[PDB]
Symmetry: C3
């Protein structure tokens, strides 16, 4: 974050990164140049000495296709909020679902990771139209104790009776919903719950998954001290985990764990394991691995603005009828990255 | 905006806003998350004692749809200009049509309003390829007397005989045209005029509206003193007001009026009324309300960088065959917004 | 550029321009409003005394179409690199292919020019996934002598056997390739340059377009430049094999490209310019044989108010004829006048 403005009670931080990034894989849909950049603005204004206003916007700009290519940029975040002393904060916009308050603890790999869930995937990650109340250190009474309460209105179909103004396809639709999170402290533990109504299209068009509500239950653990980082994340889902392109898993059990070490000279090796186990899938699928891989990588930090990394995704999925029909990659991937950040 | 750069005779201002915005309506194409942001740059260079150069770019970035959604960002403004002492200024680019010099006076509602016209709508709002000459205080000789002269070259069809490089659909096309405005802060009075050629596609593809020329005639009045803001605008148009999706109104009579009070502690209540009366519509439509509503709302300004608002569009249109076939919404809307501004 | 941040060893230069721009032409696909803007960031971090990290992003935002129009903005450059003192620099991302190291010398017209090649056109201009090594002054041993070494992985088709993640159409595809450049600033203002590149072609390039067949794309370039005493002269000659676009018809099996320009910079701000460009395709299939792919004279001028504001006129005097080749290839044969007014930061 680069502070480019600080005057008359308002401050502007520009931030982002340019990632010179290349994948090598036998999977032709992921193989090759993956260069992209992120640019963002973070602003806050002191209204009075107890009230602060703020806004944040974050933009992704792909740079791996041509100048005539289509749909190469999109907004990751955009929200405005108010925070009042110890009474908490409230923001609204496109922001992270509060489930990520805990699952982000394992989303720290050099390149891969964080993919037992997706974006626009109920309240598991970045989401449209979330209203989020947060409180740090429980009103100033319990150090290290944080919680959040979140509401999301329906984001429905493009047309018909299920429509909203901002309609999308069924895999990124949501009904009215809410979520909570709680975290507590160099060992931390955390929990999160989310619950969203599912839409009619979601319960009629996809081949897999039927249920009134999408629900997630998460617990997580983190150790962060002495240049060691250990983290684990266990999430049980109902009608909320995508079964690739086929729909949603009626039930899934998602597990992420990671171990990293920071050498003083800048090298940060990382080792991790991720699995998403789908249960009670229709069509004879039954129990199926939705995700399963070991990840071995390393990032070298030249300083806080320059790094380079390699990441090896060791894919442990078998190619079977489920991964084939669902469009799920079973190939290994090697990622090489050179990153300038500000 | 925020001056982020001022060196060796050149200054840059960064400006914009993040609007956490939600609509509540029975109209499913309107109801839902409407979060968006704006970002712009305004540049100005001192060339010599009397001549300054300038440029400005304004970008709208929607943030209410997914990261895989399309067509989510667009340029509202982009122009470059020169200003010479009291002799006036010239600029060319994507800029406001001079009709907005007067109609902007009623475009002050918390969220709604300004919609008896649209963008890329001849010289009524933001438009491609406008060359604009402006003079304030009449060459320095008459305080408060401003005028503008403006030319716009054809923006034609995508292909065929009527094409230009930057072709678009008939509803946002224009032929060669020109406009003039005059405003006098005598309490202000304003008048504006525009005259454009229509295009062959406007006279053949849509069902409604036929004529060689699009014209508008605008008069406006503004009271802005003693914490009170009152404004009205009346615009008579020919072949220039859109009849929703069905074409243009051969004649239309547009009227906007607003009354507002600014409380010292930040609250700014607002009441307004807008109507657009189409005349001589083809296909038996005859005379039709194209727009008709009363608006009640309020903005609370925390400071220059943070505000919040409610706006209530009390829609007075009757649901009939014209509003149905033309895609014109007849439902009330409530907007809630929280805005961070830089 | 405008340096808007420089702290803790990291600096950010925000740069760009807003070009109020209008074309006049009998070609209705060219005529009319052409207003656009560029915006970009050039960033740089001093890692230690000898080692610098850097990144650069450049965005093009059209402003000549409506707010409901599609695909109006795009990324021209995005790369990150390291410079290790006199050992050289390495960057990767979307960047210029090293052929442009020499052909850029003629890319100086007020509005037109630089179009015997295109973008995403092997290593001839801006390109996806280029890894570029550069060395100035030959490890610090020979002032004025620069060279570059570049590699580009395949950017393939959208679907099927030749696909990559970042697929595109045949005119903008490439196989694995490499290029090299070498320039020497001879004395007071005279430079000579050479560039070479060699890429594999893709299957769709050998099947979808009507013209051009070959396993390999190859370019050979030499250039000359004079840049002193307010005079700017430059020329470049490039011979290509399976690498110059023949409009929408495909690729020319061979092409011979030539550009030459002469400009003078008045101190009061006026910069007149005259130039000539041609691209001659040879051995085209389907009876075309030898054809002019590009041929025009350019006359224009730019007036600099200062470093942040300018205006120009540019007049493309098009010498191509309307024939079945130019018709079927979609190549414009009409004259064009451009009028621009530019704010720069
Ligand atoms: C403000 O005045 C608006 C009303 O004036 C009407 C303009 O007259 C139109 C002139 O041509 C119309 C021919 O019927
Ligand atoms: C000129 O002043 C315009 C008068 O306001 C129009 C509102 O009344 C319209 C009823 O036809
Ligand atoms: C002349 C005083 C201006 C009156 C404006 C009042 C706005 C009322 O809206 C309140 C809701
Ligand atoms: C003071 C401004 O008050 C505006 C009224 O707000 C409308 C509330 O919307 C409720 C309608 O169902
Ligand atoms: C020798 C002919 O082979 C064609 C080479 O294609 C370009 C790939 O070269 C990359 C090796 O550095
Ligand atoms: Mg179920
Ligand atoms: Mg008429
Ligand atoms: Mg050949």
């Amino acid at each position: 974050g680069a502070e480019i403005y600080n005057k008359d009670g308002n401050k502007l931080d520009l931030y982002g990164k340019i990632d010179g990034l290349h994948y090598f894989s036998d999977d032709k849909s992921v193989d090759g140049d993956q260069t992209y950049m992120r640019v963002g603005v973070k602003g806050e204004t002191q209204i009075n000495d107890q009230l602060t206003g703020y806004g944040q916007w974050e933009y992704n700009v792909q740079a791996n296709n041509t100048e005539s290519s289509s749909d190469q940029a999109w907004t990751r975040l955009a929200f405005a909020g108010l925070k009042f002393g110890d009474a908490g904060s409230f923001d609204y916009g496109r922001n992270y679902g509060v489930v990520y308050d805990v699952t982000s603890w394992t989303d720290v790999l050099p390149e891969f990771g964080g993919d037992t869930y997706g974006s626009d995937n109920f309240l598991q990650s970045r989401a449209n139209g979330v209203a989020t109340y947060r409180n740090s250190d429980f009103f100033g009474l319990v150090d290290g104790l944080n919680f959040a309460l979140q509401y999301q209105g329906k984001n429905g179909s493009v047309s018909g009776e299920g429509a909203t103004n901002n309609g999308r396809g069924w895999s990124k639709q949501n009904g009215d919903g809410f979520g909570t999170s709680l975290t507590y402290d160099g060992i931390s533990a955390g929990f999160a719950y989310s619950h969203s109504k599912r839409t009619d299209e979601q319960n009629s068009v996809p081949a897999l998954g039927r249920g009134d509500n999408a629900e997630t239950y998460t617990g997580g653990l983190k150790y962060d001290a002495n240049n060691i980082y250990l983290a684990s994340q266990y999430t049980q889902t109902y009608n909320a985990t995508r079964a690739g392109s086929l729909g949603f898993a009626n039930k899934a059990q998602n597990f992420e764990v990671v171990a990293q070490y920071q050498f003083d000279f800048g090298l940060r090796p990382s080792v991790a394991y991720l699995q998403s186990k789908g249960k009670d899938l229709e069509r004879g699928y039954g129990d199926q691995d939705i995700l399963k891989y070991v990840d071995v990588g390393a990032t070298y930090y030249f300083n806080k603005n320059m790094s380079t990394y390699v990441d090896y995704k060791i894919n442990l999925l078998d190619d079977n009828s489920f991964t084939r029909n669902a469009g799920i990659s079973t190939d290994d991937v090697v990622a090489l990255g050179l990153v300038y950040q500000f």
